[PDB]
């Protein structure tokens, strides 16, 4: 490992046009000093492999604002108006990549695996192609993503994804010893770890350079062999995107929140989406133990931090400062998604704009109105073994159906939803039997459900009035 | 995580014919207790996925002695006479699997990856098929391995290896916290970590259960979500297969091999001469030795007090690590190797072809212990592969020849050959180039001890020898 004292010296040789892996998830784990240096070198036209787009004035956002980036390979790019201006204006190329796929392709890139198969994105634009990479002002797609090869394995459909390997990786890490061994802090690891093994030249900025021996050899996140250039970052602002602090909705939403709260079981491993699902976790019995997995690489999310617990290195997938409970673990983004795709999470519960009779889900894109990427959603619904539960208002305004024979909006996955909870009904979803109404909100009739549902459903002989967590 | 107090209880539901992933590298990180429990359940016809089969009377060897294993899916038999005996006799079925591939397939097994490509095995019996899986009592082959699909990516050939998922995984770990989180010690991690995410039911035995909070969240090697059943091991014998403590033409090869080392180099030294050549490295030079079983920073043999059964080198010998070393899982280790992150791979060979083919793992009906990590170690073009070996075999039979006659380890993967008589550079296209020649010997001498033509370096020098 070569050590530098000046951030600019370590990145001075990044070529214009370089593919640079930029660590970070939201504003967490971002190499702000290496980004600052690229600001000073002015290296142009980069292909930034970065999970998110930081925000307007931080992280990748700073390089977007100075227009140093030509292409983003990311999973979620909301909260950056300049990014959205560039993307919508057609000034920026963006490959919306399933977070888990991004993590795994990066890993493959450092592990000598040219390509591998995954269930994520099967039956969506990722597999089908057509995801907009570069737009024209007019709203039409200039560059469309290409399909991924589909292949059958053990009766299921997977798609071939290829390794991502950068010219440089700008890695934000916590510490490095003088040998070049590196470790990451809390959820700040996310993509930094796998990115550090997947570039011709990896550049790591650390908050601290420490002596050799500082680390237990078993606990070196990234072995010195992967660390080519190491610099101690000069300035750390550690911006916090969404300060969510706790101190010591309407009835429709309240009702969905209260029924979803009933999906939790003890010892359950669950991943909860932003909004209602996370809120439903608020109604988990103190008697029940539910381990919340955060795709940004956390197992054991806790409630929002008290003012004194606020930590820019610890945020949930919703990018809110969080805490973790006892016995929690942090892992890289690639491990997180191996855990998710492998079906290790028992329950995944998320919002949706549409759900189909047999489990298709649509919750990441609204052609022309909502194009911020799918984050980890396609990976979350990719495993047959994980029970996926959708929580959403039953119908759209003017009673337009959200539950239908088939979704009209871009799919997050196919035959992946196992249950839907609305304020009027609870349906079990089976890829073979279809929709089965198993709960009906009191006051409403099966007929009321029929005129607010766009497909038919079996009515379970065990159909009960809709429950609410107490 | 469900905690058990009795190992039999934790595995009594394994059916006969179940595929079971068994952690361990040689005798390091083996699930002695879970294996002992299987001796009791008497579950038979097992397909055991394990790097090695331990030794004759320990580790997986026990289930071989008891004929409870119908089939081993391993990378190296090693010094297990019975394992070898059974394989050659036509009793035990064995899929010799490249160690690095064994590891990546297990990881894929828990990561939702049904299959992935790797360069390891390309051009060998692994990719081609024909690797004997099961022998006929009369020496012939009853079951041969099937061929793996080949696919090219970015100018290179790779083979398709499918995920390995077990019905059960018998995993050895160092500690578990009360929540189910698990950590490994030194090199005993090896295959235990990935096998722990790739089975319908993982059964982890630890040497210790600690309190939740005992681990720093960032340092839990195996998050609780993956540990279905956890039991604290009843008995740990800490057996050590090879106790290597510390207190000539072969030497010519070693002394020249020692000159391949450069400062800041990351290297993987094969058994014998290569490992020996590392003794001649200048203290003023920093060379980092990577061990396939999951170590970076190998040190010298341990003094008596330094001996640790959880820290052995690839040759199954007790070793130490130098400051700033690291440990990581077998799949990580091979991600590291397969990823070309190791600068120098130096190993022995029975044969090397004109263009770099290497044959170092099999000899029909006599050498059938498997390839170990060798096919993986020579799989990366970015890594410099140096073969150190005696120039000729008994009766001056050639070892450097046009085409190897022995099963290949790698196709066009050798960059240089150091023998006692010469040093040749090897190019996958132009062939051999004698760049160094032992004094007192002539190019004619070399000519008659080499089965094929070679170029002579216009700057050929007497063969150097580390001082
Ligand atoms: Cl081995």
Q: Which residues contact B26 (CB under 8 A, 6 or more apart)?
A: B51, B52, B54, B55, B59, B78, B241, B293, B312, B316
SS3 (DSSP) at B225 = helix
Q: How far apart are CA A159 and CA A129, in angstroms?
A: 12
The two tokens of residue A347 are 């329950």
Largest CA distance in chain A: 72
Q: Which among B117, B223, B341 has CB closest to A114?
A: B117
Cβ <8 Å between B213 and A327: yes
Q: How far apart are CA B290 and CA B173, in angstroms?
A: 22
**Positions of E strands within B292-414:** 295-298, 321-327, 344-347, 351-353, 358-359, 384-388, 392-393, 397-398, 400-401
Count of Cβ atoms closer than 10 Å to residue A365 Cβ: 22
The two tokens of residue B297 are 């920073």
N residues, chain A? 470
Q: How far is the CA of B372 from the centre of ligand 1 (A)?
A: 5
Residue B193 touches partner A, C-beta closer than 8 Å? no
Q: Which residues pair with A293 in a beta bridge?
A: A271, A299
The CA-based angle B240-B243-B244, given to 5 degrees, is: 145
N residues, chain B? 467
B439 burial via Cβ count (<10 Å: 0-12, 13-18, 19+): exposed
Q: Would you say A212 and A176 are in contact if contact means Cβ atoms under 8 Å apart?
A: no
CA distances from B135 to A178, B55, B90, B91 (A): 53, 21, 4, 8
Nearest residue to B204 (alpha-carbon basis) of B53, B68, B22, B62: B22
Nearest residue to A351 (alpha-carbon basis) of A325, A388, A382: A388
Q: Would you say B95 and B72 are in contact if contact means Cβ atoms under 8 Å apart?
A: yes
Largest CA distance in chain B: 71
Q: Would you say B317 and B242 are in contact if contact means Cβ atoms under 8 Å apart?
A: yes
Question: SS3 sequence, chain A?
Answer: CEEECCHHHHHCCCCCCCEEEECCECCECCCHHHHHHHHHHCCCCEEEEECCCCECCECHHHHHHCCCEEEEEECCCCCCHHHHHHHHHCCCEEEECCHHHHHHHHHHHHHCCCEEEECCCCCCHHHHCCCEEEECCCCCEEEECCCCCEEEECCEEEEEEECCCEEEEEEEEEEEECCCCEECCHHHCCCHHHHCCCEEEEEEEEEEEECCCCCCHHHCCECHHHCCEEEECCCCCCCCCECCCCCCCCHHHHHHHHHHHHHCCCCEEEEECCCHHHHHHCCCCCCCCEEEEECCCEEEECCCCCHHHCCCCCECCCCEECCEEEEEEECCHHHHHHHHHCCCCCEEEECCCEEECCCCEECCEECCCEECCCCCHHHHCCCCCCEEEEECCCEEHHHEECEECCCCCCCCECCCCCEEECCCEEEEEECCCEEEEEEECCCCCHHHHHCCCECCCEEEEEEEECCCCC
Q: How far is the CA of B294 from the centre of ligand 1 (A)?
A: 11
CA distances from A14 to A46, A168, A249 (A): 9, 7, 50
Q: How far apart are CA B226 and CA A244, in angstroms?
A: 30
Cβ <8 Å between A118 and B113: yes
Residue A25 touches partner B, C-beta closer than 8 Å? no
Indicate the pairing of strand A434-440 with strand A370-371: unpaired
Of A295, A320, A423, A439, which one is the catalytic site residue? A295
Gaps in chain A (C–N > 2.5 Å) come after which residues?
248
Indicate the pairing of strand B69-74 with strand A69-74: unpaired
Q: Would you say A71 and A97 are in contact if contact means Cβ atoms under 8 Å apart?
A: no
Q: Which residues contact B416 (CB under 8 A, 6 or more apart)?
A: B260, B384, B385, B386, B387, B423, B424, B425, B426
Give A212 to chain B, closest Cα distance, Å.
5
Q: How far apart are CA B237 and CA B234, in angstroms?
A: 10
For B29-97, the DSSP string reads T--HHHHHHHHHH---SEEEE-SS--BTTBTTHHHHHTT-EEEEEES--TT-HHHHHHHHHTSSEEEE-
SS3 (DSSP) at B325 = strand
Residue A169 touches partner B, C-beta closer than 8 Å? no
Q: How far apart are CA B198 and CA B176, in angstroms?
A: 18
Q: Which residue has the tokens 């269930």?
A: A119
Q: Which residue has the tokens 């991924």?
A: A148
Q: Would you say B24 and B191 are in contact if contact means Cβ atoms under 8 Å apart?
A: yes
Q: Which residues contact B321 (CB under 8 A, 6 or more apart)?
A: A217, B186, B295, B297, B298, B299, B311
Q: How far is the CA of B243 from the centre of ligand 1 (A)?
A: 16
For A241: left if phi > 0, alpha if psi spans -120 to 50, otherwise beta; the answer is alpha
The two tokens of residue A242 are 């969404």
- Tell me the chain A residues in contact with residue B180 when contact means C-beta distances shorter than 8 Å: 327
Give A83 to chain B, closest Cα distance, Å.
32
Q: Which residues pair with A151 in a beta bridge?
A: A158
Rg (CA), chain A: 22
Count of Cβ atoms closer than 10 Å to residue A138 Cβ: 8
Phi, psi angles (nearest 5°) of residue A321: -60, 135
SS3 (DSSP) at B9 = helix
Nearest residue to A290 (alpha-carbon basis) of A271, A276, A309, A275: A271
Q: Which residues contact B337 (CB under 8 A, 6 or more apart)?
A: A112, B100, B268, B290, B292, B345, B373, B376, B377, B379, B380, B383
SS3 (DSSP) at B310 = coil
Give A340 to chain B, closest Cα distance, Å.
8
Give A213 to chain B, closest Cα distance, Å.
6
Burial A297-324 (b: 16+ CB within 10 A, else e): bbbbbbebbeeeebbbbbbbbbbbbbbb
Q: Would you say B102 and B371 are in contact if contact means Cβ atoms under 8 Å apart?
A: no
Nearest residue to A35 (alpha-carbon basis) of A93, A14, A222: A14
Q: Which residue has the tokens 């990935």?
A: B194
A8 burial via Cβ count (<10 Å: 0-12, 13-18, 19+): middle
Q: How far apart are CA A99 and CA A94, in angstroms?
A: 14
Q: First CA to last CA across chain A, in angstroms?
A: 58
Q: Would you say A292 and A301 are in contact if contact means Cβ atoms under 8 Å apart?
A: yes
The secondary element (H helix, E strand) that includes residue B125 is: helix B125-128
Q: What is the number of helices (H) and of strands (E) in chain B?
A: 12, 29
Q: Which of B28, B162, B218 to mutate to test the interface with A (most CBs of A within 10 A)?
A: B218
The secondary element (H helix, E strand) that includes residue B290 is: strand B287-291
B137 burial via Cβ count (<10 Å: 0-12, 13-18, 19+): exposed
Resolution stated for this PDB structure, in Å: 2.0
SS3 (DSSP) at B222 = strand
Q: Would you say A98 and A126 are in contact if contact means Cβ atoms under 8 Å apart?
A: yes
Question: Could you confirm whether A93 is annotated as catalytic?
Answer: no
For B178-221, the DSSP string reads TTS-EE--GGG-TTHHHHTTSEEEEEEEEEEEE-TTSS-GGG-S
Q: Which residues contact B458 (CB under 8 A, 6 or more apart)?
A: none
Q: How far apart are CA A25 and CA A313, in angstroms?
A: 10
Q: Would you say A276 and A351 are in contact if contact means Cβ atoms under 8 Å apart?
A: yes
Q: Would you say B166 and B199 are in contact if contact means Cβ atoms under 8 Å apart?
A: yes
The secondary element (H helix, E strand) that includes residue B102 is: helix B99-111
Of B292, B332, B390, B436, which one is the catalytic site residue? B292
The two tokens of residue B307 are 């001996």
Domains of chain A: 1-233 (3.40.1080.10), 250-464 (3.40.1080.10)
Residue B15 touches partner A, C-beta closer than 8 Å? no
DSSP class of B241: S
Q: Which residues contact B428 (CB under 8 A, 6 or more apart)?
A: B355, B356, B412
Rg (CA), chain B: 22
For B242-286, the DSSP string reads B------HHHHHHHHHGGG--TTEEEEEPTTHHHHHGGG--TTS-
Residue B122 touches partner A, C-beta closer than 8 Å? no
Q: Would you say B75 and B373 are in contact if contact means Cβ atoms under 8 Å apart?
A: yes
CA distances from A129 to A108, A117, A141, A162 (A): 22, 16, 12, 15
Nearest residue to B170 (alpha-carbon basis) of B231, B93, B92: B231
Q: How far is the CA of B311 from the centre of ligand 1 (A)?
A: 14
Residue B78, CA atoms < 13 Å, CB-side half-sphere: 28
B252 burial via Cβ count (<10 Å: 0-12, 13-18, 19+): middle
Give the orientation angle of helix B99-111 with respect to helix B330-338, to 10 degrees: 110
Alpha-carbon torsion, ordered B26, B29, B32, B35, to 10 deg: -80
Q: Which residues contact B415 (CB under 8 A, 6 or more apart)?
A: B356, B384, B385, B386, B425, B426
The two tokens of residue A189 are 């690891």
Q: How far apart are CA A212 and CA B341, in angstroms?
A: 21
Residue A153 touches partner B, C-beta closer than 8 Å? yes
Q: Which residue has the tokens 């012939």?
A: B140
Q: Which residues contact A229 (CB under 8 A, 6 or more apart)?
A: A1, A2, A3, A4, A10, A201, A202, A203, A204
The secondary element (H helix, E strand) that includes residue B107 is: helix B99-111
Within 376-415 of B, beta carbons closer than 8 Å to A belong to: 379-380
Nearest residue to A419 (alpha-carbon basis) of A315, A298, A309, A264: A264
Q: Would you say B267 and B345 are in contact if contact means Cβ atoms under 8 Å apart?
A: yes
Sheet holding A425-430, edge to edge: A324-330, A298-301, A290-294, A268-272, A347-350, A387-391, A419-421, A425-430, A434-440, A458-465
Q: Where are the alpha helices (DSSP H) in B300-397?
A: 330-338, 374-377
Phi, psi angles (nearest 5°) of residue A227: -100, 100
């Amino acid at each position: 490992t070569k050590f530098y004292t000046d951030a600019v010296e370590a990145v001075k040789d990044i070529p214009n046009g370089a593919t640079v892996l930029v660590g970070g998830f939201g504003l967490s784990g971002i190499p702000e000093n290496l980004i600052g240096a690229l600001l000073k070198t002015g290296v142009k036209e980069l292909t930034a492999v970065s999970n998110n787009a930081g925000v307007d004035n931080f992280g990748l956002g700073l390089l977007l604002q100075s227009k140093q980036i030509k292409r983003m390979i990311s999973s979620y790019v909301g909260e950056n108006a300049e990014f959205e201006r560039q993307y919508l204006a057609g000034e920026l190329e963006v490959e919306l990549t399933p977070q888990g796929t991004l993590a795994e392709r990066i890993r493959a890139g450092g592990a000598g695996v040219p390509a591998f198969y995954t269930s994520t994105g099967y039956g969506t634009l990722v597999q089908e192609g057509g995801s907009p990479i570069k737009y024209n002002k007019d709203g039409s797609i200039a560059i469309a993503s290409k399909p991924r090869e589909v292949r059958e394995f053990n009766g299921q459909h997977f798609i071939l994804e290829e390794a991502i390997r950068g010219d440089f990786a700008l890695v934000k890490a916590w510490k490095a010893d003088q040998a070049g061994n590196v470790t990451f802090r809390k959820s700040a690891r996310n993509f930094n770890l796998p990115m550090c093994k997947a570039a011709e030249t990896t550049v790591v900025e650390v908050e601290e350079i420490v002596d050799i021996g500082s680390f237990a050899p078993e606990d070196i996140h990234i072995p010195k062999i992967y660390v080519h250039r190491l610099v101690k970052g000069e300035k750390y602002e550690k911006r916090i995107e969404r300060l969510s602090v706790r101190k010591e909705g309407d009835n429709v939403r309240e009702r969905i929140i209260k029924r979803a709260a009933l999906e939790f079981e003890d010892g359950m491993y669950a991943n909860l989406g932003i909004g209602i699902p996370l809120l439903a976790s608020n109604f988990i019995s103190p008697n029940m133990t539910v381990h919340l997995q955060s795709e940004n690489g956390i197992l054991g999310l806790g409630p929002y931090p008290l003012q004194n617990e606020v930590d820019a290195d610890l945020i949930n997938a919703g990018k809110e400062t969080v805490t973790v409970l006892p016995g929690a673990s942090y892992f890289s983004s690639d491990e997180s998604f191996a855990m998710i795709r492998g079906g290790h999470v028992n329950l995944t519960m998320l919002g949706a704009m549409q759900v189909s009779k047999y489990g298709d889900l649509a919750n990441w894109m609204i052609p022309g109105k909502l194009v911020k990427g799918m984050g980890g959603a396609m990976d979350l619904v990719s495993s047959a073994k994980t029970k996926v539960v959708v929580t959403m208002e039953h119908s759209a305004k003017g009673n337009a159906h959200k539950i239908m024979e088939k979704c009209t909006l871009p799919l997050t996955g196919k035959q992946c939803v196992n249950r839907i909870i609305t304020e009027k009904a609870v349906f079990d979803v089976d890829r073979k039997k279809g929709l089965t109404l198993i709960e009906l909100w009191e006051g409403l009739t099966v007929d009321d459900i029929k005129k607010s549902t766009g497909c038919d459903f079996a009515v379970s002989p065990k159909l009960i009035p809709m429950q609410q967590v107490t």
